[PDB]
Amino acid sequence: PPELPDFQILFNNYVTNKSNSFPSGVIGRIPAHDPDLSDSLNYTFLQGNELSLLLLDPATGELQLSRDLDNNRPLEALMEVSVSDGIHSVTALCTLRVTIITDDMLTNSITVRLENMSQEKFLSPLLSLFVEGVATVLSTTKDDIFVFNIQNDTDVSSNILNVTFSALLPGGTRGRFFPSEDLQEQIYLNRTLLTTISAQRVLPFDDNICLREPCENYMKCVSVLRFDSSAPFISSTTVLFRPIHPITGLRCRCPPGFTGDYCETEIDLCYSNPCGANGRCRSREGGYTCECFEDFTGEHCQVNVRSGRCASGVCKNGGTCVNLLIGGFHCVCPPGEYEHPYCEVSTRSFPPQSFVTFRGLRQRFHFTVSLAFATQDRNALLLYNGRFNEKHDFIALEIVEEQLQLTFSAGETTTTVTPQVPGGVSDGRWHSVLVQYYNKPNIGHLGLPHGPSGEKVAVVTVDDCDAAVAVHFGSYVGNYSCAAQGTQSGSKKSLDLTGPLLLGGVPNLPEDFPVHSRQFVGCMRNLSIDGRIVDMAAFIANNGTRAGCASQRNFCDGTSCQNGGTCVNRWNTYLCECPLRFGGKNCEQAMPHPQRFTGESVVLWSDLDITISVPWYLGLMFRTRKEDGVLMEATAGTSSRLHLQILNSYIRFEVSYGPSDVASMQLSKSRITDGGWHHLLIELRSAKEGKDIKYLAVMTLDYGMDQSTVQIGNQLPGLKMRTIVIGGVTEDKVSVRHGFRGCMQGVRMGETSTNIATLNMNDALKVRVKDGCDVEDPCASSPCPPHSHCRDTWDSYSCICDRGYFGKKCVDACLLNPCKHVAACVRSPNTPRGYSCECGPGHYGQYCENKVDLPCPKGWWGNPVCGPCHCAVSQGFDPDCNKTNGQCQCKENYYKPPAQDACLPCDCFPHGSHSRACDMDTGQCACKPGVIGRQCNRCDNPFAEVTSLGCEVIYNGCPRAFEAGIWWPQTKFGQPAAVPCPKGSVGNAVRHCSGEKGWLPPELFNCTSGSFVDLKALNEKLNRNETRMDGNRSLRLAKALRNATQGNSTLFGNDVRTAYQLLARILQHESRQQGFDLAATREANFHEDVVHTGSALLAPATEASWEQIQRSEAGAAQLLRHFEAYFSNVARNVKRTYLRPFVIVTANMILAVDIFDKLNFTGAQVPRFEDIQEELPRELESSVSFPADTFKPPEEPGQFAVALVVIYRTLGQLLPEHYDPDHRSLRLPNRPVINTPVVSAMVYSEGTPLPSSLQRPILVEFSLLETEERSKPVCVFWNHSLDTGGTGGWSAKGCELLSRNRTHVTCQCSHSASCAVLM
């Protein structure tokens, strides 16, 4: 017995006018298998195939494509197949799909490699999954995906595949494909999501061929894919697929912002003055920013704040715009961390393992980055950016050893820049960083920079710092390196950053990044790029970042320090600076008198009785600046060194019992040698683990502001502190080693801080003890050189040397003339930067490096920055443009009419005007006395004529004038004049110089156009019953006609007759065809061609033609008959051909074809303007209503019906003025007018035919052309079978007015024909 699995066939046909890639012969067989090896199975089709789409071998089951399949048309169909062994029968389904490939398709196409998945599961049943995962990632429908190639990518033996495909841009606008870079970025971002949804190991993207930079100058290298060859069908068990082989190549394009034959020159976009008077323009690579002034906002600062009103997008992040009653508006921010007046986010905090992802940088040569940060870690990452491969170009900025460092590589070498700031920057206070990168140009021999040089310069600045003086001669000035610079040279000309922007720490990828650190903790704010400030809320990714900075809250609020306590805010807390003799959090303790120590004072306690117990507290209060020395040495037990020093400006605390070192703990996390007051407390605490008792050594610095708890491990406990010493190192109580210097306050000892067991200063140790703490003023000597302000800092000072001076020597920089280009250095009495650079004319800027080349070059205009004129030369405009305004002026000989956007030549008559140039707009020549007309072409006397001497009254016929191009010659009365058709036309134009009105309106019926000369010759033979017409000739004639009819031109009477005859012949032939013999099945655009030709033919400008044309043929009548018969055949064969529903819109024609499910159709409005997204003019907003009972029966094939509706806009007034002669049926009003577009709706039901007369009427909703309401409508239909006019006519029988509002008129009709409302 057998079995078969439902299967599909995919034919990817790359149709071109050059290659007949259509395969022939055997392509495959039914995927039929049977364990029995003796039976001869019978292969027959049951249903589906009706027009022989596929040729089947009944015996072998071989499948062959039929010849009718060769066209540029996608298709889908479902076939039923039966297999029989002679005793049992099974059925199966096969879905056939044909997809067309174009050149625009192969241009926008990308390839993505997959690991461990060869041609065994990607051409079996999982391809659907991929074409979905891709849809979900792209947020698009599965139809937009078009996978056209899947070939074995086993370069050598590796399990890797190679799928190349393309995508359609969502939006409904046909013809748009995703740019390659857009696809690349969109695939790269949601990679893990795709991995999860599609269950596969997606491989990363590899480097491109442009790595070697083979292109020249400022160009751009892009890899592209073109057609190479076609392969036969690859067979599986479920799918027979035909692949198409591409081949790679390169292409160089000029990026914007550059000009020249090699784009070697750059353009400042601010020359166009976009900000206007309400702002100032900042240039940037390929763009500009506005510092647009106060009370003005908007992308072009086109919106006023105080006097404006609500506008879309001004209230960001969902802010509700409320219009103030007196003008202006307010953006109500939603409750959250949003900043007025625009509800933005600027400050963020970063806990461990949290990072954000923004958009990457795309600037090629020059850029600037700046931000502000605050943290405490010695080593941490700040910023990184690179490529997908994590190689070649990359940049990164970090903090190492409390010093900023920038490391970057342009693909060749790594370079580090390290400005030095005294005291570090890891103090928890906010700091700002600025970085600039730019490339020097190749200065040409003529002084013109020809392309970019090989020198790349990076500059780093930290906080307030002068860059020029630093970089040049900071060392010569003294110690001043707050800024730094690095330089690179190499063959590469540009810096490429493919990857996105990250912040706060790299994602924990297995690939190591070229970075010293790996993470970061802390707060940042104001990430400004090129002046523009980025909103923190507008992030692309977020792996744990939380908005705001909680540690920087003003904690002094709501807190009241005690007597003398001054509140200050500190990291995550506050601190009350207490006066002397007061302390304890909020100054809640009294301490004994402080003592001043100068390297010789040491105190000690002994002769004490203490037993090992729990707990114990040792508290001290200190302030100093020494970076070493013993603050407290306590020999617990035998020789248990409790070494509490300030080693290397950090509180170190060793505990070493006996001859062994046991434990230690340091406070390197905080430098405490600042000289400020600090309290510390040793805590000996218990901890019962199981049965044993351990201890714990918690020192709390500043009442637990800091706290470190060394686990006192089993060796350490049981050893209480026996001897206590503070002051330094001493053993013979005479010589002092490492004596302490500074100021210290009272001492706490015992189980609790409240255990005030005063040790009697008078008792114990009294050696070198100086009462008090006051110190002689170091600034009394006043040692800084002049221009100084000495400031005592508690046993230290520093020259706050006067402004305008720099470095340790505090020297004026203006003396060392940093101003460039021989510019004078003038030091104003008050200068924010201390000095100024006075410069001569022709140079502007802070250092006046910039220079203006006025006058600007030819075609270049702008002050003080030149810019292109951008004049439209093709429209007769002079290329030269206003050197101030920038307005383009037309070339001489021309004048631009007010209603026309192109200046046309004046074409004045030399004998009629004193001058020759005609006035602007009006185009009036310098008319001499006696002559009138816009071109001075008419004497006042209808009998006087123009000669060199003026308007002389000639006697004998129209003269020799130039009116209307024709030098219409002398002619008598009654006699016409036939002269050769005007220039560009052939035939014989005739005019009659009538005795009454002179020249009659010329009869151009004979005049034929050059475009129709071949067409006229081709028409002549056709009506002679000679040559015979065929489908291919039909297609070629349709295409030629559409081309000759496109554009705007005065179609002629012989031309309109020819067009009518040709359309009639074509439609008559098309009505005679059936099945695949219809030209419809071979072409896709024939519908568009015919509808466009029809719309062009019915142009209103031919009314004067039409009234003539109308006395010759029926015209619109037989044309409409041809149309309806054609569409009837289309409806009869649509299901056979499987044509997809479609709507065609032209300025005067609407065509809609749609397919409904019979069993589920519940009425609808047609054409589906709800489903129509194209911009619809308000007049065209009519409708046709099918009620829900349309399909419902009046009170397996035949499940789908079709509906086609055609709307003719102006056809009604185009029709001959013919009305029903029966006065009884039609009472003719005084001025009846067809006021509605003609609608032809046709519903076709497969199977049992519906009655010819619609047993259930259809609804139609029209609009009106003119809006006057002075009379009444009648819903009529223009019959064709009616004897009125032979071609039928308007009649009210069977249709009447149901409803009428001020904008719509709804009538009902029981016929599927042409109907309209005679309003």
Ligand X SMILES: *[C@@H]1O[C@H](CO)[C@@H](O)[C@H](O)[C@H]1NC(C)=O
Ligand Y SMILES: *[C@@H]1O[C@H](CO)[C@@H](O[C@@H]2O[C@H](CO)[C@@H](O[C@@H]3O[C@H](CO)[C@@H](O)[C@H](O)[C@@H]3O)[C@H](O)[C@H]2NC(C)=O)[C@H](O)[C@H]1NC(C)=O
Ligand Z SMILES: *[C@@H]1O[C@H](CO)[C@@H](O[C@@H]2O[C@H](CO)[C@@H](O)[C@H](O)[C@H]2NC(C)=O)[C@H](O)[C@H]1NC(C)=O
CA gap 1319, 1314 in Å, rounded: 16
Show the binding pattern over residues 799-838: x = contacts ligand X (CB under 6 A), - = does not: ---------x------------------------------
Question: Toward ligand Y, which CB reaches closer, 24 or 139?
Answer: 139
CA gap 502, 384 in Å, rounded: 6
Assess 189 for contact with ligand Y (CB under 6 A). Answer: yes
State which of residues 179, 214, 287, 544 lies at the interface with ligand Z (CB under 6 A). 544
Assess 418 for contact with ligand X (CB under 6 A). Answer: no
Nearest in space to 629 (alpha carbons), one of 541, 727, 518? 727
Assess 508 for contact with ligand Z (CB under 6 A). Answer: yes
Show the binding pattern over residues 475-494: x = contacts ligand X (CB under 6 A), - = does not: ----x---------------
841 exposed, middle or buried (CB, 10 Å; 0-12, 13-18, 19+)?
Answer: exposed
Bridge partners (DSSP) of residue 1241 are 1205
Q: Which does 189 bind (CB under 5 to 8 A by kind): ligand Y, ligand Z, ligand X, none?
A: ligand Y
- CA 67, 10, 1138 angle in degrees (round to 5)? 60
Question: Toward ligand Z, which CB reaches closer, 354 or 1182?
Answer: 354
207-231 as b/e: b if 16+ CB within 10 A: eeebeeeebebbeebbeebebeebe
The number of residues that bind ligand Y (CB under 6 A) is 5
In the complex, the smallest distance separating the C-beta of residue 346 from ligand Z, rounded to whole angstroms, is: 6
Phi, psi of 203 (to 5 degrees): -90, 155
Question: Toward ligand Z, which CB reaches closer, 89 or 1027?
Answer: 89
Assess 1225 for contact with ligand X (CB under 6 A). Answer: no
Assess 884 for contact with ligand X (CB under 6 A). Answer: yes
State which of residues 119, 353, 403, 542 lies at the interface with ligand X (CB under 6 A). 119
Please report, for residues 23, 674, 1223, the alpha-carbon distance to residue 1230 in angstroms, rounded to integers and kept in the order given.
68, 106, 13
Q: What 3-state DSSP class applies to 397?
A: strand
Question: Toward ligand X, which CB reaches closer, 119 or 363?
Answer: 119
CA gap 1277, 1317 in Å, rounded: 8
In the complex, the smallest distance separating the C-beta of residue 246 from ligand Y, rounded to whole angstroms, is: 27
Left if phi > 0, otherwise alpha if psi is -120 to 50, otherwise beta: which for 973? beta
CA gap 1188, 313 in Å, rounded: 42
| Pair of tokens at residue 352 | 């461990």
Structural contact between residues 508 and 502, judged by C-beta atoms closer than 8 angstroms? no
CA gap 670, 365 in Å, rounded: 41
Q: Which of residues 414-433 bind ligand Z (CB under 6 A)?
A: 432
CA gap 1074, 1083 in Å, rounded: 15
In the complex, the smallest distance separating the C-beta of residue 133 from ligand X, rounded to whole angstroms, is: 23
In the complex, the smallest distance separating the C-beta of residue 329 from ligand Y, rounded to whole angstroms, is: 22
In the complex, the smallest distance separating the C-beta of residue 428 from ligand X, rounded to whole angstroms, is: 23
Structural contact between residues 1063 and 1094, judged by C-beta atoms closer than 8 angstroms? yes
Q: Which does 882 bind (CB under 5 to 8 A by kind): ligand Y, ligand X, ligand Z, none?
A: ligand X
Structural contact between residues 557 and 702, judged by C-beta atoms closer than 8 angstroms? no
Residue nearest to ligand Y (CB): 189
In the complex, the smallest distance separating the C-beta of residue 388 from ligand Y, rounded to whole angstroms, is: 14
- Can you tell me which residue has the tokens 């704010």? 525
Assess 139 for contact with ligand Y (CB under 6 A). Answer: yes
Assess 42 for contact with ligand Z (CB under 6 A). Answer: yes
Structural contact between residues 1313 and 1240, judged by C-beta atoms closer than 8 angstroms? yes
Distance of CA 572 to the CA centre of its chain: 40
- Can you tell me which residue has the tokens 């015209």? 1115
CA gap 448, 443 in Å, rounded: 6
Assess 543 for contact with ligand Z (CB under 6 A). Answer: yes
Question: Toward ligand X, which CB reaches closer, 626 or 748?
Answer: 626
Assess 190 for contact with ligand Y (CB under 6 A). Answer: yes
- DSSP character at residue 446: T
Q: Which of residues 577-616 bind ligand Z (CB under 6 A)?
A: none
Structural contact between residues 333 and 322, judged by C-beta atoms closer than 8 angstroms? no
Assess 882 for contact with ligand X (CB under 6 A). Answer: yes
Question: Toward ligand X, which CB reaches closer, 643 or 1122?
Answer: 1122
Torsion sign across C-alpha atoms 1113, 1118, 1123, 1129: negative
Q: Which of the stretches 186-194, 313-321, 383-391, 1039-1047 binds ligand Y when contact is defined by CB under 6 A?
A: 186-194
- Which pairing describes strands 7-13 and 89-100: parallel, antiparallel, or unpaired? parallel
Q: Would you tell me how many other CB atoms lie within 10 Å of the CB of residue 746?
A: 20
Assess 38 for contact with ligand X (CB under 6 A). Answer: no
Assess 260 for contact with ligand Z (CB under 6 A). Answer: no
Assess 526 for contact with ligand Z (CB under 6 A). Answer: yes
In the complex, the smallest distance separating the C-beta of residue 371 from ligand Z, rounded to whole angstroms, is: 8
Question: Toward ligand Z, which CB reaches closer, 506 or 927?
Answer: 506
Assess 91 for contact with ligand Z (CB under 6 A). Answer: no
DSSP secondary structure of 1049-1110: ----HHHHHHHHHHHHHHHHHHHH--GGGSGGGT-SSHHHHHHHHHHHHT-GGGHHHHHHHT
Question: Toward ligand Z, which CB reaches closer, 229 or 508?
Answer: 508
Q: What 3-state DSSP class applies to 1137?
A: helix
Assess 44 for contact with ligand Z (CB under 6 A). Answer: yes
Assess 538 for contact with ligand Y (CB under 6 A). Answer: no
- DSSP character at residue 33: B
Q: Which of the stretches 185-193, 310-318, 515-523, 1204-1212 binds ligand Y when contact is defined by CB under 6 A?
A: 185-193
Show the binding pattern over residues 1004-1033: x = contacts ligand X (CB under 6 A), - = does not: -------x-----------xxx--------
Assess 372 for contact with ligand Z (CB under 6 A). Answer: yes
Question: Toward ligand X, which CB reaches closer, 824 or 1013?
Answer: 1013
Bridge partners (DSSP) of residue 881 are 888
Question: Toward ligand X, which CB reaches closer, 1102 or 1182?
Answer: 1102
Length of the chain (residues): 1319
Q: At what angle do helices 1031-1045 and 1086-1097 cross, to 10 degrees?
A: 50
| Pair of tokens at residue 320 | 């509700």
Q: Which does 649 bind (CB under 5 to 8 A by kind): ligand Z, ligand X, ligand Y, none?
A: none
Structural contact between residues 902 and 876, judged by C-beta atoms closer than 8 angstroms? yes
State which of residues 232, 507, 718, 905 lies at the interface with ligand Z (CB under 6 A). 507
Phi, psi of 648 (to 5 degrees): 55, 45
In the complex, the smallest distance separating the C-beta of residue 284 from ligand Y, rounded to whole angstroms, is: 25
Question: Toward ligand Z, which CB reaches closer, 315 or 946?
Answer: 315
Q: Which of residues 457-486 bind ligand Y (CB under 6 A)?
A: none
Q: Which of residues 942-981 bind ligand Z (CB under 6 A)?
A: none
Q: Would you tell me how many other CB atoms lie within 10 Å of the CB of residue 916?
A: 14
Q: What 3-state DSSP class applies to 477?
A: helix
State which of residues 252, 324, 540, 800 lies at the interface with ligand Y (CB under 6 A). 540
In the complex, the smallest distance separating the C-beta of residue 36 from ligand Z, rounded to whole angstroms, is: 15
Q: Which contiguous run of DSSP H or E holds residue 888?
A: strand 888-890
Q: Which of the stretches 403-411, 452-460, 610-618, 1041-1049 binds ligand X when contact is defined by CB under 6 A?
A: 1041-1049
State which of residues 38, 192, 1048, 1301 lies at the interface with ligand X (CB under 6 A). 1048
Q: Which of the stretches 188-196, 428-436, 606-614, 995-1003 binds ligand Y when contact is defined by CB under 6 A?
A: 188-196
Q: What 3-state DSSP class applies to 104?
A: helix
Q: Which of residues 137-176 bind ligand X (CB under 6 A)?
A: 152, 154, 159
- Contact residues for ligand X, defined by CB under 6 A: 118-119, 152, 154, 159, 479, 808, 882-885, 1011, 1023-1025, 1043-1044, 1047-1048
- Contact residues for ligand Y, defined by CB under 6 A: 139, 189-190, 193, 540
- Contact residues for ligand Z, defined by CB under 6 A: 42, 44, 346, 353, 372, 432, 507-508, 525-526, 543-544
